[PDB]
């Protein structure tokens, strides 16, 4: 245990940009945390970034201002930042640096863990086998997610991705109701929603919607406004990951963590890179974005001898429809599968604007099937995808050719397409939808057609619902 009293200095050669250079530091340590005091008694904090013998350097979080040559004091803590991790935060809200903002007290944590975290044993990892209930029909029906599966959500600036994320927060659950309602009483599910760089308006939107839902018994809300310090922006995801790991493994939970606006996170990475005096790389972003983003993404999966999992869903703000931009390219490389949204659908006033034509879930084949759910879910999704493709193609041929040369089966395809965007894609704000009734809806849509052209499914399984 640290039995060593803290040291306070007063000498300082100066500062430089948002950093602070001093001298005559006794045995400095990298990434050491420090508090500051101004002539007017104003308190701040900081982190140590560079060291050279007695010449230490430290970034001030709050932001350098009014600093004096002599009448300022630093006070070293002699330790890396120490997260106050524990189980009882659920039902609480915190700011960037973890200070309560819901009029709560300092957390009385039972554990003190490293913020940066550690990697997992690659040997100790399981193949995902179940699915997670999301409540959006377009998600579960087409691209159902598994425990440990990592799926991002691509979206353009100025789209309703934030509202979709909030709906997923207030709607996400398990699927134990299928086996038995009594079994669902094991509510080990949890949520950890971290928003960064978001305008105060939508932060208020999030917190108000959460308070309305009345389901914060199993939520951990981290919030970081835009005006807050740039350094603290790269801190919140690590805290969220630490808490999620603690809940999932030490408290044997199934935690769905969600992250928002990693484009601005990359901008914060650029900020620290500029502070580091390291020459920028491609498109100005630092050349070591890969390692940092990889360490952020890979903190999930299931482990041996444990009852719990972690599922990550980040939101990436695709810059100006640029698939070749480095950030989305690398995010697609690391993660597995992707889901797209569409601007045209948003213009059509169909919510949520989800494009299933390019959407793809990587390991859905094992996330769904008999026993876990109804047997023919994957069959149904394949049928809907193929029929949607045929409907789009015949509509494209239609738009230039004409109804004079159109056959009845094509009219049925057009009707199915229209009913499909009218009903299945359409969700609405507060429509709690379950997998079984979405399967029923898909079956009703498929029943517009007879068995003759419903070729891809064996008749042995078509007898299950087609003759209803």
């Amino acid at each position: 245990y640290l039995s060593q009293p803290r040291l306070t200095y007063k000498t300082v050669s100066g500062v430089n940009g948002p950093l602070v250079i001093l001298d005559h530091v006794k045995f400095p340590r990298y990434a050491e945390i420090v508090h500051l005091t101004l002539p007017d008694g104003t308190k701040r904090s900081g982190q140590v970034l560079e060291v050279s013998g007695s010449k230490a350097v430290v970034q001030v979080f709050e932001g350098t201002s009014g600093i004096d040559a002599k009448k300022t004091s630093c006070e070293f803590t002699g330790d890396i930042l120490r997260t106050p991790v524990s189980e009882d935060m659920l039902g609480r809200v915190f700011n960037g640096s973890g200070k309560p903002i819901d009029r709560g007290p300092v957390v009385l944590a039972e554990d003190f863990l490293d913020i940066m975290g550690q990697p997992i044993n690659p040997q100790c990892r399981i193949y995902p086998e179940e699915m997670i209930q999301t409540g959006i029909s377009a998600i579960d029906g087409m691209n159902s997610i598994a425990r440990g599966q990592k799926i991002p959500i691509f979206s353009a600036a100025g789209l309703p991705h934030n509202e979709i994320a909030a709906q997923i927060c207030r709607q996400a659950g398990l699927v134990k109701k299928s086996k038995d309602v009594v079994d669902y009483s094991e509510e080990n599910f949890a949520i950890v929603f971290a928003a960064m760089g978001v305008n105060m308006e939508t932060a208020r939107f999030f917190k108000s919607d959460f308070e309305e839902n009345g389901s914060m018994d199993n939520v951990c809300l981290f919030l970081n406004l835009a005006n807050d310090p740039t350094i603290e922006r790269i801190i919140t995801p690590r805290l969220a990951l630490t808490t999620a790991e603690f809940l999932a493994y030490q408290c044997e939970k199934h935690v769905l963590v969600i992250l928002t606006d990693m484009s601005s996170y990359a901008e914060a990475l650029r900020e620290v890179s500029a502070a580091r005096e390291e020459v920028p790389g491609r498109r100005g972003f630092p050349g070591y974005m890969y390692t940092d983003l990889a360490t952020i993404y890979e903190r999930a999966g299931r482990v041996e001898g444990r009852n719990g999992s972690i599922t990550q869903i980040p939101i990436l703000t695709m810059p100006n429809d640029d698939i070749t931009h480095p950030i989305p390219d690398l995010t697609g490389y690391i993660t597995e599968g992707q889901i797209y949204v569409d601007r045209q659908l948003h213009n059509r006033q169909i919510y949520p604007p989800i494009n299933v034509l390019p959407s793809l879930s990587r390991l859905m084949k094992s996330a769904i099937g008999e026993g876990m759910t109804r047997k023919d879910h994957a069959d149904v999704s394949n049928q809907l995808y193929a029929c949607y493709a045929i409907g789009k193609d015949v509509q494209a041929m239609k738009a230039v050719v004409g109804e004079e040369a159109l056959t009845s089966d094509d009219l049925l395809y057009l009707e199915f397409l229209q009913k499909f965007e009218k009903n299945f894609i359409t969700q609405g704000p507060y429509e709690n939808r379950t997998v079984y009734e979405t399967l029923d809806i898909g079956w009703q849509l498929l029943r517009i057609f007879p068995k003759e052209m419903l070729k891809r499914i064996p008749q042995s399984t078509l007898s299950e619902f087609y003759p209803r």
Partner: protein
Amino acid sequence: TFGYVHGVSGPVVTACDMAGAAMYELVRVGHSELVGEIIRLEGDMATIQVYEETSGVSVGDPVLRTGKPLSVELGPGIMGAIFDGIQRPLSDISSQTQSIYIPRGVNVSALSRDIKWEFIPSKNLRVGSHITGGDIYGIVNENSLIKHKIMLPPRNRGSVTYIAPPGNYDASDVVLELEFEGVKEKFSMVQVWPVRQVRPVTEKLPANHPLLTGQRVLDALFPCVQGGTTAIPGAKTVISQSLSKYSNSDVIIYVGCGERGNEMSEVLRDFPELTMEVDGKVESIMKRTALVANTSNMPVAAREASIYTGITLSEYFRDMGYHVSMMADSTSRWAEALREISGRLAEMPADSGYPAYLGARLASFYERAGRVKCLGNPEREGSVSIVGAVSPPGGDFSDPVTSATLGIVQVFWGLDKKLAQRKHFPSVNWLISYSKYMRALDEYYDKHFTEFVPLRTKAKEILQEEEDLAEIVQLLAETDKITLEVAKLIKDDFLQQNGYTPYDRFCPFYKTVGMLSNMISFYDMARRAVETTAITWSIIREHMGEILYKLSSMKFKDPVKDGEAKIKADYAQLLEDMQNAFRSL
């Protein structure tokens, strides 16, 4: 004390024996008392970015000890004068020399020290009372339209020692002293508040009120809010003075660009004769507004700090309890000034050459808004809206500044380059455009013209349908020509390239939904394979004749003399002509 200068170059002055002073503090340098702000301090060496002309200095010249951080004085005498980046009372400076021509190193307080104003204390003041940091001392009769007020700064409570009676007090003429825990002190009418850090607030309040925007197309398609943030590329400023007539906003504050001197000159020349009507009274002048003007010849520092002083002033004035707005003819000069100071300080830039500070500082400048609950007497609410952006270089959507705007602000205005090179100033690349709100106008629409909601949806459908059929035309049928022609006509109607001729300066929203409805109905009746019972588009084209001509001439109404009822009658005869021409088919 004072210290010495070390050798210099460009718009920066090095200086030794500077130790002991804060690096974010003011300073005076040279025999002409040049105003400067320290920017980099190491040891006793210290570089200092200068504000005005940076020639004729010498090594070793005196360097007076620092004053306080950057700051502006505020109180009476605002909304009646013209200023600049660092608040020079220029209208006074012209008389101070009787020649103008060169303003030379002047040090004149922005507030005249020989003008007196009448102050009546509020009745609720009592001897020995306790006053928190937001209670209004009393009323001061400023002028005609608006009488703003004074309160204690953000300071704790204290027993009152003496409050002045009602009377006419000049200059400072200290209004009251107050007592604290062992400290008695004196307070003047004005107060000195540092820039770059603005007084806090108690709470942010739900913004639910439509903005009576002073421009069509902008609110007609992507509505705004009275207390939000917006971005308009400067392909102009007429919308602000249109708000001065239409919006309920009490005061508007335009900050100058300096990139052009000419339209600055005509704005300054044309401001006095801005006439309109408040409460049946012809206010010939919109004097109740704060104007700051910076010119490009002024060094980079003033250009950088002008917007900060402007937002400090507007935030002060909204803390009174008035709704206000701001127009910003900046965000290209600002980024370039940031680049210039970064290059001078010799630190590596980003990909485009702009420093990493751009996003953080730009967001800090933008957000700074919203309706508010007060820190004192609960009566004060106040609010502010920010509007203003720049046309990027050659329509650069990928400019880092632009990505920052898309990150922070949510109302983005499109402007296609392909049409912007064609002097289509009110044109839009609506693809790159997002509306911040849609639920704000639910309650407004339930009470006023509820049928707007689906019509604009149909218009957007037309707008994307043309966006595809254009490339079909690049390489046909009549069915697509229906939508193509409807889109061309509505584009001619709404994208009103009027050149600021006076007849376009009017915004009767309810007498500008009419042509939208007419075009939507025309398309709806023409969408049934032309023939209502199902004939090609050409049949109706040669059948209509002068009908389309008058549909185009629809725009040339002058609402000021037409009369609203006559305009409704014009809509009616338009509509009956539509039905007659289609009943003939």
